[PDB]
């Protein structure tokens, strides 16, 4: 299912063309255009690579560690240079400098589905059908060609742009970086599968669960954990807990689910097969790739770009 499209394949080569001319990334070649978002561990800025004129997203993570340690990280990130999927943010290059490690990539003017949600309030099903295909497709490539998991699926990790592109970002690739980052830098797991919340079996199934949870929140408009009362259900459509509480409520409670009537049965059944606790029972990639929801959505002609640009102003 990793086949390529004409327009897509043409866009994949474009990046390559540019990436070639850019050359070695140097700290003094960048110019801060603005801040994009606070990503746990470091910060993301909208920079300008003066020498090339290109606009990029520079991730900065301050890690005062031994040189060999740093030179090590940069060695691991060199892997992202091989990732070529229209469902994953284009990588430009990484490097260290004066205390910080820089991760330069492709800028996504659409932002994260996290912000998009806030703007829209709640994403339409037909739209969520495009995201599913994207995320679903992304994970496959991450495993198919790159034999690695994502390990961190959430609305904030789903970047989109004015071209109607949906790509994933924030997937671990450097063990050392994670090690050094694990220091003070630490994020939540409220989007993680229960299986992992027990040091048990964890594969793409863990990502598939993450997605399922995200899709619901985007569809409903809020975090679907725990299950919102009926007062809101009839409010939002017509019709708190501690980081450790949810972490367990997620393990000792019935998985969330999309409210009936408002959504399509196929979609409802789709998420459900995603939020199946037992990673063994939960649907696998190819299983979802051929799920009625994905087939119906893959066929639907949805102008994602238009709706997005209209939902955020763009
Ligand atoms: C709260 O926001 C986040 O966690 C983001 O994923 C979302 C936010 O910053 C983060 C840290 N982020 C990241 C966290 C980790 C890797 C990449 C990003 C990231 C990228 C971009 C943007 C972005 C663009 C426009 C508005 C906000 C944006 N962000 C990113 C990127 C981008 O255009 N290209 C990569
Ligand atoms: Ca400098
Ligand atoms: Mg993260
Ligand atoms: Na600098």
Question: Does the annotation flag 110 for ligand binding?
Answer: no
Question: Does the annotation flag 107 for ligand binding?
Answer: yes
Evaluated on CA atoms 41, 44, 50, 55, the torsion sign reads positive
Angstrom resolution of this structure: 2.7
Q: Return residue ranges of the chain for CATH 1.10.510.10.
A: 110-314
- Counting from 1 in the atom list of ligand 1, the atom nearest the Cα of 108 is 33
Q: Give me the CATH topology for the region 110-314.
A: Transferase(Phosphotransferase); domain 1 (1.10.510)
CA atoms within 13 A on the CB side of 67: 0
Q: Return residue ranges of the chain for CATH 3.30.200.20.
A: 1-109
Q: Cα(106)–Cα(14) distance, rounded to whole angstroms? A: 12
Q: Is the CB of 154 under 6 A from ligand 1?
A: no
Question: Does the annotation flag 156 for ligand binding?
Answer: yes
* Ligand whose nearest atom lies closest to the CA of 119: 1
Give the CA dihedral 63, 64, 69, 75, nearest 10 degrees.
40
CA atoms within 13 A on the CB side of 200: 13
> 305: burial class by Cβ within 10 Å (0-12, 13-18, 19+)?
middle
At residue 190's C-alpha, the angle toward residues 44 and 264, to 5°, is 100
Using N-to-C axis directions, what is the helix angle for 113-120 and 204-220, rounded to 10°? 20
Q: Is the CB of 280 under 6 A from ligand 1?
A: no
Q: Cα(21)–Cα(51) distance, rounded to whole angstroms? A: 10
Q: Supply the residues annotated as catalytic.
A: 152
Q: Cα(29)–Cα(55) distance, rounded to whole angstroms? A: 12
**Which residues, 6 or more positions from 47, have their beta carbon under 8 angstroms from its beta carbon?**
30, 31, 32, 33, 55, 56, 57, 58, 104
Instruction: Answer yes or no: are the C-beta atoms of 279 and 202 closer than 8 Å.
Output: yes
> Is it true that the peptide bond before 226 is cis, omega within 30 degrees of 0?
yes
Q: Cα(206)–Cα(277) distance, rounded to whole angstroms? A: 10
CA distances to 33, 114, 131, 198, 249 from 252, rounded to whole Å, are: 46, 27, 29, 12, 5
CATH top-level class for 1-109? Answer: alpha beta
**Which residues, 6 or more positions from 310, have their beta carbon under 8 angstroms from its beta carbon?**
none
Q: Which of 46, 159, 313 has most ligand 1 atoms within 8 Å of its beta carbon, as the pocket-test mutant? A: 159
């Amino acid at each position: 299912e990793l086949e390529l499209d004409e327009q897509q394949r043409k866009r994949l080569e474009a990046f390559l063309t540019q990436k070639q001319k850019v050359g070695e990334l140097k700290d003094d070649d960048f110019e801060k255009i603005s801040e994009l978002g606070a990503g746990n561990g470091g910060v993301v800025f909208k920079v300008s690579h003066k020498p090339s004129g290109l606009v990029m997203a520079r991730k900065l993570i301050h890690l005062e560690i031994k040189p060999a340690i740093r030179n090590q990280i940069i060695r691991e990130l060199q892997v992202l240079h091989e990732c070529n999927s229209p469902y994953i943010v284009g990588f430009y290059g990484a490097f260290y400098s004066d205390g910080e490690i820089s991760i330069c990539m492709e800028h996504m003017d659409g932002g994260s589905l996290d912000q998009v949600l806030k703007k829209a309030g709640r994403i339409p099903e037909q739209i969520l059908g495009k995201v599913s295909i994207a995320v679903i497709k992304g994970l496959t490539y991450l495993r198919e060609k790159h034999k690695i998991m994502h390990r961190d699926v959430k609305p904030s990790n789903i970047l989109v742009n004015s071209r109607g592109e949906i790509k994933l970002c924030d997937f671990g690739v450097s063990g050392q970086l994670i090690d050094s980052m694990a220091n003070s830098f630490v994020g939540t797991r409220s989007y993680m599968s229960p299986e992992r919340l027990q040091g048990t079996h964890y594969s793409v199934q863990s990502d598939i669960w993450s997605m399922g949870l995200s899709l619901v929140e985007m569809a409903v408009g809020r975090y679907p954990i725990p299950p919102p009362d009926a007062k809101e259900l009839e409010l939002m459509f017509g019709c708190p807990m501690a980081i450790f509480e949810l972490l367990d409520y997620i393990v000792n409670e019935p998985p969330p689910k999309l409210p009936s009537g408002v959504f399509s049965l196929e979609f409802q059944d789709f998420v459900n097969k995603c939020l199946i606790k037992n990673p063994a029972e939960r649907a696998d990639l190819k299983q979802l790739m051929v799920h009625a929801f994905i087939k119906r959505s893959d066929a639907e002609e949805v102008d994602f770009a238009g709706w997005l640009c209209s939902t955020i102003g763009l």
